Amino acid sequence: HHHHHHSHMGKQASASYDSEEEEEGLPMSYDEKRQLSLDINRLPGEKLGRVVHIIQSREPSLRDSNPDEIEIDFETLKPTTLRELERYVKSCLQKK
């Protein structure tokens, strides 16, 4: 009356990931800042949801100082951020 039962089992695997898409940071011309500004200006207040959101996301000093009167200075912003405004607007213009 005696038994012997050894059992050892140890597993791991999790290498499924894919997300790293970088911004272009492309040279945005001054004419493109003005055009972009006008194209966002013709978009109504609830379309401005993403617009202001990515400006507060990049620029934290505006977020804390003025959550009310948020000066989105297109001509003096990041060309990466201006590409995010570019991505949004052209997706919201060019249907299909």
Partner 1 sequence: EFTGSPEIKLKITKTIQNGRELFESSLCGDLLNEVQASE
Out of 1, 68, 94, 96, the residue judged to bind partner 1 by CB under 8 A: 68
Q: Does 60 bind partner 1 (CB under 8 A)?
A: no
How far does Cα 1 stand from its chain's mean position? 69
Out of 75, 90, 92, 93, the residue judged to bind partner 1 by CB under 8 A: 75
How many chain residues are in contact with partner 1, going by CB under 8 A? Answer: 23
Q: Please give the backbone phi and psi of residue 51, each rounded to the nearest 5 degrees, phi first.
A: -50, -60
Cβ atoms 55, 81 nearer than 8 A: yes
Cβ atoms 70, 62 nearer than 8 A: yes
Residues that bind partner 1 (CB under 8 A): 30, 33-34, 37, 40-41, 44-46, 48, 51-52, 55, 67-76
